[PDB]
Each structure stands twice: as C-alpha cells, then as structure tokens.
Design a protein around this ligand. Structure first.
Ligand SMILES: O=P(O)(O)O[C@H]1[C@@H](OP(=O)(O)O)[C@@H](OP(=O)(O)O)[C@@H](OP(=O)(O)O)[C@@H](OP(=O)(O)O)[C@H]1OP(=O)(O)O
Ligand SMILES: Nc1nc2c(ncn2[C@@H]2O[C@H](COP(=O)(O)OP(=O)(O)OP(=O)(O)O)[C@@H](O)[C@H]2O)c(=O)[nH]1
Ligand SMILES: [Mg+2]
Lengths: 272, 107, 77, 51, 852
C-alpha cells in the first residue's frame, strides 16, 4: 500500500545532500520575524500592508482619520514626532500602537540564535575548533598531590573504549537541524499534489535587485497563501464511501494494468 | 525629496477586460527608508545558501566578509587543508565542465 | 544501602530519642546520622538507669553501641 | 524562472519545472469535477430538469 | 483541606509536616537572562515530583508562563511560585519554595519582588551565550540585596550539538564563564567570602531540554554506584581545575603527565557526555544498543523508535535520574532560613534588627507575633479578586483569623494607613494548582485571601491588639526607573468607571507600574519599555476591563536642571509680608548625584560622618558640609539643600523652628519643577538668608511652604535651566557580519556605539551602545527587520543627559508635525510637554517672583 516509511540516518543524510538545491539552509525562524502567517493575519485584520507583504480588502470598514474631530486626546499640538510610526511597529506591538485591535494575533518573540557551524570539509574530525569560533583568551582550592586518594583498579572513564566520533556523526548533527522532513526518520506517505516544492521559496523575502513583476508575483503568492490559511476550516465527518470501489463492485467495469500514455490516448478518444 | 515624502507620510497618517499581468501599481515595498530599501540580505556564516539560485553565483556575489574572516583567523594547517579541499572542488568543477562542454569547443 | 538507614537520614534535623546498649536515654536534635548508625546530636537531655537527668550541648554516639532510636511520627507517611 | 536563469544560464526556453502548475490545475479540477458531472448527468438523462 | 490535587511522588501531608520545621525550608529565586532555561528547568522538576504531568515531545511544557500572553509571545511575563519537596543526593527530602522569575530586562520588577522574599539566588547562565546584560544586572542586584548566590550553567548541550567544540575547549568555555561570574561578584561586593567554583559546590552543570543536571559530587556518586569503593566526595574534590589523572599510579596531580593528558574534568565528566550524545545522535541504529548496554541503560522497543531529540531526552533522563545536584547546591549554600533571618531583618525591616521586634523576628519561631510581609498580588482568572502572596517572618497565619494590614505610608506616628481585615482562605501555591491549608507557620510563602482591599503594592500583615510598636518593611527598591509614558482614554466616555477599575487592577498587578491623573484630566501610565507597556495594555483591555481604550503615542518623562549659578540671589516673602527667604542655585559636582542616589551617603547618618564624606571626597568646607538640610524630593534625591546662613544674621534656633516647613517647601518644589512640572536633578539650593517671624501662628504652615516653593522656582529659573533626557543602554547580540548594519541603524537615531567585541567561544558579537530613550521607540524592530532577524537587542535605562537645545528660548519656531533638528529639541520638548500637562503656554523667569 506504500503508506508508511522508516529510513536510516545515512540514507537520510544522502537524500538531504541531494535535495540541497531546493532548501534554503535556514536553522531558525528568526528569519521570518514579522513575515509569518500570524504577522500577516494581524496586518490583514488591521488593513495594513507589510512592505514585502500582501494587501487585502479592509476586514472592517476602515476608520477614516479624516473623520475624528480633533478631541483634546488626539490634539496634534501635543504630539512630539521623532520617527514616523511605521506599519511594522503596529504589527510588532498590536496593543500599544493600535486603537481597537480586533482579531489581532500576537507574534512569537525572539528565539535564541542557533549558532550551528556547518561542516564544509568532510575529512575534518567531527568535533573541531572551527575558525568561525572566536578564540578563547586563556587566563582554585585543589587538594594536594601528597594525599593518599587512590582509585580502585576497576575504575576508568565510562566509555573509554568507544571512539569519540565516528564516520556518521557530523551527518547526524547536521540532520538535527535539517528542515522538515529531513529531520525525521519515520512517518507516512503523502501525495505528489500535496507536496509543494517552492512554497518555502515564496515564503521567504524576495531576492534583492529583482524586477517589479516578480516582486508583485511574490506578493500575490503570499496573499493567496495567507487567504487559504486563514479561511481553512476543519473537514467534516463523512462515512468513507469509495467511488471506484463501488464501480469495481459493479459488473460493467474490469481492471487491467496499462501504460500511462496508452491510457491517455484512450481517454482523449473517449472524451472526443 | 525623501524628507518631503517623510513629512507627507506623517501628515497623511495624522490629518470585463482580461488582464493576465498584475499591474505595477499593486507593488508594495516602495519605501522611503534606506533601512527598508536595502535590507542586508542574510549571509549564513558564508556556508548557507538560498534555495534555487546558482551556488557559484551566490559565492561570487556574496559580501566576501566571511572569506576575509576565514583568511584572517585560519591557522596555517587549516588554510592548507581548505586550499586542498578547494582544489578538489575545482578539479570536480573542471571535470564536470569538460564532460558537459558545448559542441563548439570540442573536438 | 538499607531501607531503615534511608529513613534514619530522613530524621536528620528532627528531635529523636536514643537508647544505648547500656540503657542511657538521650533525647535531642539529630544533626548527622552516618551509614553505620553513628549519631551526632545537640541540646540533649540524658536519663540514666537510676532515673536521674542531665543536660548536654553536644554528643556523638557510635552506631554499634546503640540499641535503638525513636523517630518523629512525621516520617511515617 | 528567476531562480533558474541565474549565473551561467541565460534567458531561454530550457527550464522545465512543471510540478507547480501541474498542482494548480489538478486542484482546480478537484473542485470543477462535481459541477460538470452534475451538468452532464442532468443532460444525458431519461428526462431533463431545468428551472 | 482535602481538595483535589494531582498525583505526586511525595504527599501533601508530608509537605505540611515539613512546613513546620524551618530548618528544612529553602527559599530560592531562579533568575537569569532571557530564554536561558529557567522555566524548562522548573518544568522538569515538576515532572520529577509529579509523574503524571509530562512535557510534550516536540513542544516544551512550561507549567510556568501560564498566562495567555506568555504562551503566545513565548517570553515569561510574570514570576511564578512553586513549592515542592525535592530529595537530596543523600536521600533526605527538603521543602523548596522556588520563585521562577522572568528573564526579560523590562520585567526586572518581578525579580526584585521575588528577591525581597527569597533567601537565595540561583543564577542561570547559558553555556553558549555566557554572561549577558541581565546576568550582570541580577548579580549586582542580588549581592546588593544581601542574598547568597549560586550558579547553574545551562544548555551545555549547545557546546556539543551546535558549536561541536572539542572537550578541552568546552572546558575552557565553562571555566571562562566561571571566571566572569567571580569577577562580577568581586566587583560588586567588597567581601571575598562569596567565591563561586564547582569544587566548592557553588556551580552546577545542566541541560534542561535533555533533562541533565549534575555537580561534581553527583557525577562522582554515579561512579560510586557503578563501582562501590569510591568516596564520591573526595572524587568530586579532585575532578575539576587543572588536576591531571595518572592511571599508572591511579593518582591525581597538579602537573600534567605526557604533555597530552586532559584535565580530570575532561577525562571523566565531559568526554563520556560527549560520547553519549554523539552515539545517540549519529549512530542510533548501529552501536547505540551496545553503548546503552555498557551504560546499563535498557530501553523498550517502543521507546527506541522515537526521533533523535525525544530519544536523547529519554536516554539522558534514564542515565542521570533526578536533579540532585541542584538540591545539593541549594541545601549547602543557602541559609536555613533560620540562619538567614537576621540579615533579612537587618536589610528590610524599617525598625532595625536591634528593635525588640527585630529580635523576635530574627529568632523566626512559629509561636510569636504575626509579621507577614506581602510583596506580590496574584489575580484570579476572572480578574475580580486578588490574593496577596508573601512570606511569614514570625508567628502563624490562621484561616479566618482577623489581621491588621499596614500600607507603605504607615508610620508609628501617622496611624491612618492601617486597616483591620479578615483572612478567608490560605493556599500553598504550586504553579498551576493551589493547595488549600488551614494555617501557615513562620518561614514560608503563602497566598492570603481577603486582605487585598487596603493595599496597592506592598503591605505588612500583623495582629490587632498587639505589636503596638510595629513598623512597615521597606518598600521595594527597584533595579531601574520607569520612564516611558503613555496616555489612556476610553472609546465610549460612558464606560469610564470600567477603565478606572482596570487601571487600579493593573496598578496592583504590575509592581513597578505608576498610574496617575495629570492636571488636564489625562490618565498616564509609566512603564519601563515597549513590550512592558504592550503587555500592560493587553491585560487592561482584555483581562480586567472589557472595554475599548485609545492609547496616545509613547513619550518619555524629562527632568530639569541648571548649568551655572543663579545670575542674582532670589527671594520671596509670605502673604503675611513676613518670613522672607533668600536662595541661590548652582550645579552639583560630577558624581555627587550618583552617590546620593546609590546611597553612598544617607541623611540619616550622623552629621559627623556626613560632613566627613562631604569634606574628604567632594572637596567641600566642613562649614558647608555640616549645613545640609535636605536631599531633594525624597530622602535620597539628586538635589541638595544647604543653608549658608551665617550665625550672625539669623537666630539659628529661630531658623530651626521653621526648618521643617522650609524643607517641605524645598522637597515639593524639587518634586514638581517650574519648567514642565517634572523632577529637578543635580542642583544645589543654598539658603543665603532667612528672616523668620517671631510667632508660630505667623510662621509655619500655609505661609512658608508656598513661599519656599516660589523661592526655589525663582532661583532655579534664574540659573540657566536645561532639560535632561533619559538615556537607554542598548546591548545587541549580532552575527560577526551585521555589526555595520547595527552601526547604521543606531546612527540613524542619535545613537553612539560605546563598544563592539566578539563573544569568546561563539561566532557572535556583542555591540554595546547608548540611545536616547525618546528615539528608542521602534529601534529593536527596526534592527531585527533590517537585519532579517539575525540581530537582537535589549535596552535599559542608564542615565540622564542634557538635551542638546536650550529650552527657555522663545526665538525658535516649532511646526506641529515635523521632526525638529537638534538645536531646539529642548524648546520643542518643553512646550509640548507643557501642553500635555495642561499648564500655560510658556514660562517666564519672572512668573514666580514677588516683584512682578
Ligand atoms: O511569460 P512572461 O512572464 O511574460 O515572459 C515573457 C515570455 O513569455 P511569453 O512568450 O508567454 O510572452 C518568456 O517566458 P516564457 O514564454 O518562456 O514563459 C520570456 O522568458 P525567458 O526569456 O526566461 O524564456 C520572457 O520572460 P523574462 O523577460 O522574465 O525572461 C518574457 O518576458 P517579457 O514580456 O518581460 O519579455
Ligand atoms: N539547546 C537547548 N535549548 C534549551 C534548553 N533548555 C531550554 N531551551 C530552549 O530555550 C528557550 C527558552 O525557554 P525557557 O527556558 O522555557 O524560557 P525561560 O528560561 O523561562 O526564560 P523567559 O522566557 O524569559 O522566562 C526555549 O524555547 C527552549 O526550547 C537546553 O537545555 N538546551
Ligand atoms: Mg520563565
């Protein structure tokens, strides 16, 4: 039935290496600060556009700031202006900068930087002081050696015999931070339709120095992604009836194994 | 012009046909802040790459800061090992090119 | 290591009573209890075999020469 | 295209990467199917229902 | 009791039995930097003591950070108390009252509140980042608050799985962290008795994600269990610190054999840990079964099918077991608190230890007077009723027993900030569930119901009909100053009372929040930072008051000072036309304001020592040094009041008759200020002359105080006045590359980069800089978005600095909605804040004189 799988770590590493070209090699979600579905939800609910983000119709009827009638509160002779309060600030702190924040979503704050040292040269030992690491500028009531403390004969470090690092240690460490599904080692099987390859491509920022048409392509792709994510509702409780199983149970149909191109020509002729 | 547009932003905040191409007026990200126009694309420690884009082009167009940092910090033996690895990669690149040469530069 | 021994160490910091092999009865705070039942105590009341009492600040009794100890009921649970 | 045509590769017709549009049109077909099935069923029937 | 409680290893009855014995109670505060593992460590302790509560595999259960805002944002917002019974490595159980505090720098008020009632501090330091801004600030705060301190180096698995450093260099990193901590402690404390070193047991090594925690003692105990003949205490004494192992002699030495042997630490502790982690992560399917068999660890087939991270957590949990190293640390190096009671009373209680009640409390016995001290107020989920969380320093709280509550303004003479109340129920607060009890003896933490009404921030609960000589514990002294200011109004004015109730409730909930009503009827809230104020606004708008509220744009609170002596000596007279005062104003010397604020000098001192300091340090004549009267708005303020009055011109007895009235007027004037009605900073007011009327009903009261304030205002205005801006100290933790981007963003906002250095052992850099508080708005988001999230910053108030422009300049012209250039920022800031406060349009140096 081809429903579930469980691979081995060397297989998973090799598949990751082959797929490298389709993956962004990101080890954190700090990249998506104010660029994830929650920030987009907040911007939509407030009818504001992130510079690189989509742009929807006002969820509510927008308050025209030419409508309020200059109370004592919003007097402009009292306001000290230093920097224009950009839309990013209002998405970042929806409750401190917005009046009437309705259907607004709070955004995950910082996450600690993942300081991972990608291993460029396989031949190197797994544990190795990479040049990227800043040097440690070197420089205690110890007992006296004359003391009679002696270890028994049996005693030695817990895993002396076992080697520190093996051939497939760096690979496993890298897989620990590989993106999904390359961080797994077992699971289920999906549909080629259900696997999108460039969703993570247009979820990222647009590369610098790109033409306006591709920039707008990015923005509209994000718009429809957000719309689907927001409008999603859970499916309903069906009874699991199968059309082709019913057909097979009938007597007007029979099964056979054919070449796909032959079936395609067959279907073209039948449709005509 | 930038200061005038900034003040304009402050003032404005406070006071049938089939088209197969999105209009250029729909574009967002048309900002006035340099911090938001040029946004310092990520340099993943000089060892991470954007998906899809050519690796050689990415290396060529990267800031080179991490290359300078590596040449500064690397020990002599580390530099020798890295140079040997780069030589191996260059040999692989040249062999791949020689195999996948165009017919205008073959025998 | 024995189950009763763990329960003894649990009584460290509590007021306990100790009878020796010679029947002198020492009541006070258990400071330290060793694995072999060696017992350091403080602010003791001692009741001799004749019935008379005395008061001591600091004592230490060897485990072997202890007949038994009474511990709080705070421990029983 | 704008990720395919970077570096040595220049503008041209040599980029075949069709999973994206293939998925788009399959998902459109998913929703269209019942509509056309219903239409053809109403048409090729012993009788006809309109209104 | 008999309430329903979750299944637990220990039993509530044993917990209550322990509660009576004060020698087995450990009051500890878990503090550290942001995201350094405190909450997950507490989660794991809770899991150890509650076999039913379990942390999700791919999601981390906290069991603190209970609030919805906390869960959504990912950052702890409020301190949480947890009372548990944890075993010792020896097997002896103790009672631990652990107050887990937030790590963010804005919420340091929670940490100070926890410190006030804690006896020990456990400082969590990340193994990769190292010592950071909040770690330094918290070390300073704890040593100044006179608490014993111990350290836990967390996230030691980053050295193995992220930086993949060699064992020796990981050891070097840990040693460097320890040296940094010791340096900071020595810098902030004169006494050297507090030295941190793992050999002594003051430092522990932990990885909360993978459930590892140990000291040298505990990891020697594991060796002892595997081979029975070792004294794990001596083994631990020898492990750490440049002690090389000789296996031929089976003996340790200070001298390295073979010039390639690793320290005993690397040989015995670090290396096997490296091996375990590497084998689990890289060779899970080839030789992991053999390695676990060697370790004696047997895991079921269902378990060994897990993914790498759950498998690591499970295997490490099975190997190490409980967190007994933490318990050993705390039990050894934190008072009883029978022992720690006396310093607590010496530092906090206002009546001093020498007092009879000081002795009665430093004894710390359940059978005595009641002297509870409540520092926190926790709101029920409905948000209606609050419960006072505090510690019992003497006596016993009984449910239903009437008590007397004293607020912060109560004095033994002004007996009107007290009120009799009745306590309804008592709780022993575990984080997500409250144990209800009937009583609580001294030396414990307790939640009290029914005493919330007569208190706002801090209170002391005593018994009525007794303790007639009872005085309040000192109000909390906060690590920083709340400067950011916002204004709040409702959307529908018909619902103002709801907003007022919400404002009161948030004032109670947030210890350092200051809510006030200006003269123009504007409700103002003061907070430390933008995230702080965002959380405050969320709670106000959603939890407490359920209305819609408009918020004004953020702005900071300025101060006023002078830069040169008054042009002429100013004077005034009472409406009675007697009681003439004559003053001058000048600027103070550099650092004197810092001394007064940091309490390097106290007015309570004997005039002998006070004049001694003033004469020896700041080059004053003893005549003036013994002529001090007041220290600004508070007893510790940055403005001084001297009386230069020579004895030949004014009867000193007569002057002393109105000393108190003149001091009151001076303090009020300094508190308000003439420029914009804000604090006056760094000014010396010198009473040059004082003609005092003869009769008390002609002087004092409603005659001198207004005249005193008017003279102070006139002298300050005559001296060249200036405004002072708050300045924030920013620390950015960026990659090796984005330093230039940080420079650019900071330069765009009047910033000044003080320093930029690498983090030893890590590929990152720390950039320390100074920013103006008023420009700091949106700075962190600017940085993060411009750098693509690779740079993160935390800012905190540092010092006051003079705004570049000259405020009292009427030549300048200001447009309503333009960012002004520097040379008249002072004028803009003065005029607009005057408008906000609702005062007149401009202030003239003659406004408060008697001549015009
Ligand atoms: O389809 P578009 O985005 O408008 O791209 C059209 C063109 O397409 P048409 O022939 O349908 O007009 C080519 O694209 P394809 O036909 O190959 O899809 C061509 O692309 P290549 O040069 O990469 O083959 C080029 O696109 P670009 O200029 O982005 O390379 C061009 O665009 P212009 O209309 O701007 O010339
Ligand atoms: N690598 C590693 N990460 C950890 C470890 N412990 C916690 N973390 C991560 O560190 C982040 C900080 O989470 P917490 O420790 O729960 O937060 P906190 O310590 O209470 O700090 P505050 O949020 O300010 O209260 C979490 O997202 C964890 O995933 C650890 O031992 N190793
Ligand atoms: Mg926390």
């Amino acid at each position: 039935t081809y429903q579930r799988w469980q691979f081995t770590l060397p297989m998973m590493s090799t598949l990751y290496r082959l797929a490298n070209q389709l993956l962004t090699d990101l080890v954190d979600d700090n990249y998506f600060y104010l660029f994830d579905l929650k920030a987009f939800f907040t911007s939509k609910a407030l009818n504001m556009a992130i510079p690189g983000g989509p742009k929807f119709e006002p969820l509510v009827r927008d308050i025209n700031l030419q409508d309020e009638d200059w109370n004592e509160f919003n007097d402009i002779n009292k306001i000290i202006i230093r920097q224009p309060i950009r839309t990013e600030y209002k998405i970042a702190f929806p409750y401190l900068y917005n009046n009437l924040p309705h259907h607004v979503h709070l955004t995950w704050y910082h996450t600690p930087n993942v300081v991972f040292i990608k291993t460029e040269d396989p031949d190197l030992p797994a544990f190795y002081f990479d040049p990227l690491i800043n040097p440690i500028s070197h420089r205690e009531p110890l007992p006296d050696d004359d003391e009679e403390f002696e270890l028994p004969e049996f005693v030695e470090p817990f895993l002396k015999d076992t080697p520190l690092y093996t051939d497939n240690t760096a690979n496993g460490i890298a897989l620990l931070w590989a993106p999904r599904p390359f961080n797994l080692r077992s699971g289920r099987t999906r549909r080629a339709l259900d696997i999108p390859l460039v969703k993570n491509w247009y979820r990222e920022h647009c590369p610098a120095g790109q033409p306006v048409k591709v920039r707008v392509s990015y923005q509209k792709l994000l718009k429809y992604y957000v719309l689907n994510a927001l409008k999603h509702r859970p499916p309903k409780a069906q009874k699991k009836r199968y059309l082709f199983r019913s057909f097979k149970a009938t007597k007007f149909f029979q099964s056979t194994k054919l070449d796909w191109v032959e079936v395609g020509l067959q279907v073209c002729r039948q449709g005509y | 012009k930038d200061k005038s547009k900034e003040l304009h932003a402050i003032k404005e905040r406070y006071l049938r046909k089939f088209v197969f191409e999105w209009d250029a007026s729909e574009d967002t990200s048309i900002d006035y802040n340099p911090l938001y126009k040029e946004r310092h694309q990520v340099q993943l420690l000089g060892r991470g790459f954007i998906a899809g884009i050519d690796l050689k082009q990415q290396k060529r167009e990267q800031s080179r800061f991490y290359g300078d940092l590596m040449e500064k910090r690397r020990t002599l033996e580390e530099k020798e090992q890295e140079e040997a690895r780069l030589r191996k990669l260059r040999k692989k690149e040249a062999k791949q090119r020689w195999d996948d040469r165009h017919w205008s530069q073959k025998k | 290591i024995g189950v009763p021994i763990k329960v003894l160490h649990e009584a460290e910091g509590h007021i306990v009573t100790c009878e020796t092999n010679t029947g002198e009865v020492y009541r006070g705070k258990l400071i330290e209890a060793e694995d072999n039942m060696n017992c350091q105590m403080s602010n003791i009341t001692v009741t001799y075999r004749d019935g008379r009492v005395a008061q001591l600040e600091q004592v230490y009794i060897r485990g072997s020469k202890i007949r038994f100890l009474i511990l709080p009921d705070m421990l029983k649970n | 295209y704008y990720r395919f045509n970077t570096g040595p590769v220049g503008k041209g017709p040599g980029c075949g990467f069709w999973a994206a549009g293939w998925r788009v049109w399959l998902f459109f077909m998913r929703g269209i199917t019942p509509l056309l099935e219903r239409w053809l069923g109403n048409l090729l029937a012993r009788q006809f229902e309109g209104r | 009791m008999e309430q329903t409680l979750p299944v637990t290893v220990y039993e509530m009855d044993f917990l209550a039995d322990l509660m009576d014995n004060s020698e087995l109670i450990r009051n500890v505060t878990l503090c550290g930097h942001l995201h350094h593992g405190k909450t997950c460590f507490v989660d794991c302790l809770i899991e150890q003591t509650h076999p039913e509560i379990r942390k999700r595999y791919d999601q981390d259960l906290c069991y603190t950070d209970i609030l919805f805002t906390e869960q959504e944002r990912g950052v702890g917002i409020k301190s949480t108390p947890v009372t548990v019974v944890l075993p010792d490595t020896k097997g002896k159980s103790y009672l631990f009252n652990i107050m887990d505090t937030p790590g963010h720098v804005n919420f340091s008020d929670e940490v100070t509140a926890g410190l006030r009632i804690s006896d020990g501090v456990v400082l969590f330091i990340d193994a990769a980042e190292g010592v950071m801004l909040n770690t330094e600030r918290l070390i300073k705060h704890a040593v100044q608050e006179r608490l014993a301190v111990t350290v836990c180096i967390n996230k030691i698995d980053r050295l193995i799985l992220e930086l993949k450093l060699p064992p020796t260099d990981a050891y070097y990193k840990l040693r460097h962290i320890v040296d940094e901590v010791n340096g900071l402690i020595s810098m902030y404390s004169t006494d050297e008795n507090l030295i941190l070193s793992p050999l002594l047991g003051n430092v522990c090594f932990s990885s909360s994600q993978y459930s590892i925690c140990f000291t040298l003692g505990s990891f020697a105990k594991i060796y002892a269990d595997t081979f029975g003949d070792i004294n794990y205490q001596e083994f631990a004494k020898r492990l750490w610190g440049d002690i090389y192992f000789n296996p031929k002699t089976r003996k340790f030495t200070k001298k390295a054999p073979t010039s390639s042997s690793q320290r005993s630490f690397v040989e015995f502790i670090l290396e096997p840990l490296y091996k375990i982690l590497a084998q689990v992560v890289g060779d899970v399917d080839t030789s992991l079964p053999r390695t676990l068999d060697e370790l004696g660890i047997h895991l079921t087939k269902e378990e060994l099918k897990l993914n790498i991270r759950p498998l690591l957590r499970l295997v490490c949990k099975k190997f190490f077991g409980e967190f007994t190293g933490f318990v050993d640390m705390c039990v050894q190096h934190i008072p009883s608190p029978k022992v720690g009671a006396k310093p607590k009373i010496e530092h906090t209680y206002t009546g001093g230890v020498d007092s009879d009640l000081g002795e009665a409390m430093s004894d710390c016995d359940p059978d005595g007077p009641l002297m509870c001290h409540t520092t926190k107020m926790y709101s029920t989920d409905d948000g209606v009723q609050f419960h006072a969380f505090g510690r019992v320093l003497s006596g016993t709280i009984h449910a239903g027993q009437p008590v007397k509550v004293l607020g912060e303004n109560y004095t033994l003479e002004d007996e009107e900030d007290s009120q009799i109340c009745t306590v309804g129920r008592l709780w022993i607060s575990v984080a997500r569930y409250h144990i209800e009890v009937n009583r609580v003896p001294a030396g414990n933490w307790v939640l009290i119901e029914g005493v919330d009404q007569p208190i706002v921030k801090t209170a002391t609960i005593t018994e009525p009909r007794g303790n007639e000589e009872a005085q309040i514990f000192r109000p909390l002294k906060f690590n920083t100053t709340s400067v950011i200011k916002i204004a709040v109004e409702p959307v529908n004015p018909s619902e103002l009372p709801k907003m007022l109730d919400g404002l009161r409730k948030v004032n109670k909930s947030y210890p350092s929040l200051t809510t006030k009503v200006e003269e123009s009827g504007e409700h103002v809230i003061l907070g430390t930072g933008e995230l702080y104020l965002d959380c405050v606004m969320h709670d106000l708008r959603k939890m407490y008051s359920e209305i819609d509220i408009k918020v004004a744009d953020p702005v900071v609170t300025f101060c006023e000072t002078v830069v040169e002596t008054s042009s002429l000596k100013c004077f005034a007279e009472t409406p009675n036309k007697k009681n003439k005062i004559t003053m001058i104003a000048e600027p103070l010397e550099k650092g004197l304001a810092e001394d007064i604020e940091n309490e390097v000098v106290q007015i309570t001192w004997n005039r002998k020592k006070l004049g001694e300091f003033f004469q020896t340090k700041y080059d004053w004549d003893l005549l003036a040094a013994r002529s001090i009267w007041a220290f600004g708005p508070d007893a510790t303020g940055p403005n001084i009041l001297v009386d230069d009055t020579l004895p030949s011109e004014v009867d000193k007895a007569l002057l002393g008759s109105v000393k108190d009235s003149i001091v009151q007027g001076f303090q009020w004037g300094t508190r308000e200020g003439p420029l914009c009605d804000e604090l006056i900073r760094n000014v010396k007011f010198k009473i040059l002359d004082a003609v005092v009327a003869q009769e008390p009903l002609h002087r004092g009261g409603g005659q001198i105080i207004p005249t005193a304030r008017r003279v102070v205002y006139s002298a300050f205005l005559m001296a060249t006045p200036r405004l002072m801006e708050p300045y924030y100290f920013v620390e950015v933790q960026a990659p090796a590359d984005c330093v230039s981007a940080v420079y650019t963003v900071l330069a765009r906002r009047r910033g000044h980069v003080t320093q930029d250095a690498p983090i030893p052992g890590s590929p990152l850099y720390t950039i320390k800089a100074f920013i103006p508080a008023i420009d700091s708005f949106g700075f962190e988001t600017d940085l993060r978005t411009h750098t693509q999230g690779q740079a993160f910053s935390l800012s905190v108030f540092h010092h006051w600095q003079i705004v570049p422009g000259d405020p009292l300049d009427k030549s300048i012209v200001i447009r309503p909605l333009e960012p002004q250039p520097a040379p008249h920022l002072a004028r803009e800031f003065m005029i607009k804040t005057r408008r906000r406060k609702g005062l007149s349009e401009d202030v003239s140096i003659s406004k408060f004189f008697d001549d015009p």
